[PDB]
Amino acid sequence: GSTGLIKHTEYMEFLKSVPTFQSLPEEILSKLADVLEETHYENGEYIIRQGARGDTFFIISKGTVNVTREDSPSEDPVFLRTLGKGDWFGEKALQGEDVRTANVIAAEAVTCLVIDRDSFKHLIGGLDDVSNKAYEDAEAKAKYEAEAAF
C-alpha cells in the first residue's frame, strides 16, 4: 500500500536475491534495506574505477553497466560483462580491505542501491554466534568454489 512499505519490501527483495545475503536473518535484511542509498549515474560515468580502494557494494535498480578491465595501456580494455536491473557488483568491498580489479561503467542512465563496508560490518557484527558462523562459512565456501573452478 504505502510508498515506504513498497520501497522497503522492494529493497529487501533485491537484497534477498544476492546469494550470500540470502540466509541472513529477516531482521538483518530489514536493517540492511534501511541502509541502502539510492545513487544515480549518467551514460559513460565510471561508477567504479579499477584500482580504487573501494568500500561500497552496488545493486542495480535501473539501467545497465559494462564491466571492463585494463590489461595493457595499448590494447583495447577487456570487456568482461554487462549487468542490468537486479544484478550487483563490488561485493568484495564489504568483506574487508579491498581493491577494485575492474571498471564498472554506466551504459545509460543508471540507478544503484548502495551500501558501504562500515554500515555493513556493524550490522553483520551484530549477528549472534550461530548466525555469524553460518554467514562466515557461506563466504568461505563461495570463496573456495569460485577459485577451485579455475
Query: Which residue numbers belong to the known binding site?
Result: 81, 90-93, 100-101, 135
Q: Tell me 57's DSSP state.
A: E
User: What are the E-state strand segments in the chain?
Assistant: 37-41, 46-48, 56-62, 65-69, 78-83, 88-89, 103-106, 110-116
The candidate with the shortest Cα–Cα distance to 101, out of 71, 66, 143, 63, is 71
Contact 95, 139 (CB under 8 A): yes
Contact 33, 12 (CB under 8 A): yes
Three-state SS for 128? coil
Residue numbers of the domain that contains 64: 1-150
Task: Output the domain CATH number for residue 148.
Answer: 2.60.120.10
In the chain, the number of structural domains is: 1
Stated length of the chain: 150
Q: Which three cell numbers stand for residue 136?
A: 562466515
Neighbours of 106 (CB within 10 A): 21
Tell me the resolution in Å: 2.0
Query: Which residue numbers belong to the known binding site for 3',5'-cyclic GMP?
Result: 81, 90-93, 100-101, 135
Distance CA 54, CA 103 (A): 12
The candidate with the shortest Cα–Cα distance to 55, out of 107, 90, 24, 16, is 90
Query: Which residue numbers belong to the known binding site for 3',5'-cyclic AMP?
Result: 90-93, 100-101, 135
Distance CA 72, CA 7 (A): 43
